[PDB]
Design a protein around this ligand. Structure first.
Ligand code: NA
Ligand code: NA
Lengths: 120, 120
């Protein structure tokens, strides 16, 4: 709950951002901020693919617990993701539409991750 | 072996490319092309992190076997990776230095993956 201001900041800064969330390695979502605004595209196709990535996101996210791995992406045709470690139990995930700014997404999540880590 | 011309094309096109390889889900490398040329940076630190990503790359690569997942990245401070599925048994991996062109890497691997798939 202390996180949501940071999750909202990520979505606000990244063109095409669907959602920014904290997720547990136990597969239980902790907090989210979702794109509320009328997008310049129809995002329902993206929401379908994002739902269909959730199992695989948490599987790939496990690699973040290794010292060397700092960032993981699991991407579909319509949806890109960026994930970073926030604690031994939690990771941060940004989902954006494939036509969004993936470079800005990676940069903004790198800047925001320490702020989320500080709220634990 | 029919692949290597395609692996060389990827490394030649992407600034900061360390290597482009075909790897089995059995954890056995099939073919590679490595950056031979004198880089504008010292890449030994990157080679160390790339070695330390190998276990986790193959773990995250498993997600490519799902219908929805088309592309996976497992990144360190010094090394970025992009992976795509080439067959039920094999995936394609591009590793580049963190200061390389990640956007171009993703684009070139997407263009090259079908050419590698055609050589099976
Ligand atoms: Na890590
Ligand atoms: Na797939």
């Amino acid at each position: 709950m202390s996180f949501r201001t940071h999750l909202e900041s990520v979505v606000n800064q990244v063109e095409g951002a669907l959602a920014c969330s904290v997720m547990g390695f136990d597969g239980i979502s902790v907090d989210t901020f979702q794109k509320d605004e009328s997008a310049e595209l129809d995002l329902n196709g993206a929401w379908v693919e994002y739902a269909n990535l959730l199992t695989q996101l948490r599987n790939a996210a496990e690699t973040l617990k290794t010292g060397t791995v700092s960032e993981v992406s699991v991407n579909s045709e319509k949806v890109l993701t960026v994930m970073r470690l926030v604690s031994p139990d939690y990771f941060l995930v940004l989902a954006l539409h494939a036509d969004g700014n993936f470079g800005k997404g990676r940069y903004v999540l790198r800047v925001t991750a320490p702020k989320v880590r500080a709220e634990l």
